[PDB]
């Protein structure tokens, strides 16, 4: 097939997002809405205890 535009291979992981799009204002964002759902941040790793209780609250937030 000949696609005058492009083809991405993914719908992210969620179907029916209104994945059929006639008017597409394209946000290509190399940064995630998935940083992580757990306590510690995406790149921030801690095996010390007191430093982990610090990130648990706003990790789920900085997503939203």
């Amino acid at each position: 097939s000949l696609i005058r535009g492009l083809v991405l291979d993914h719908g992210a992981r969620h179907p029916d997002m209104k994945k059929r799009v006639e008017d597409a204002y394209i946000l290509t964002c190399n940064v995630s809405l998935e940083y992580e759902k757990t306590e510690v941040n995406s790149g921030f790793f801690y095996k010390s205890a007191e430093e982990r209780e610090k990130l648990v609250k706003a990790e789920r937030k900085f997503i939203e």
Partner: protein, 51 residues
């Protein structure tokens, strides 16, 4: 004192221990009391800021 044993009358020696200890007792009651409530609040604070 360090390079001297100072001669003094009671009149100077007596009130020095009087007011100093009492003046110390005020200040020591303040901070150690304030340390606990800081920990109380800092336990709430440290979970917030570190994202």
């Amino acid at each position: 004192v360090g390079g001297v044993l100072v001669e003094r009358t009671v009149k100077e020696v007596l009130p020095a221990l009087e007011n100093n200890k009492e003046q110390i007792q005020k200040i020591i009651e303040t901070l150690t009391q304030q340390l606990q409530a800081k920990g109380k609040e800092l336990n709430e604070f440290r979970e917030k800021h570190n994202i």
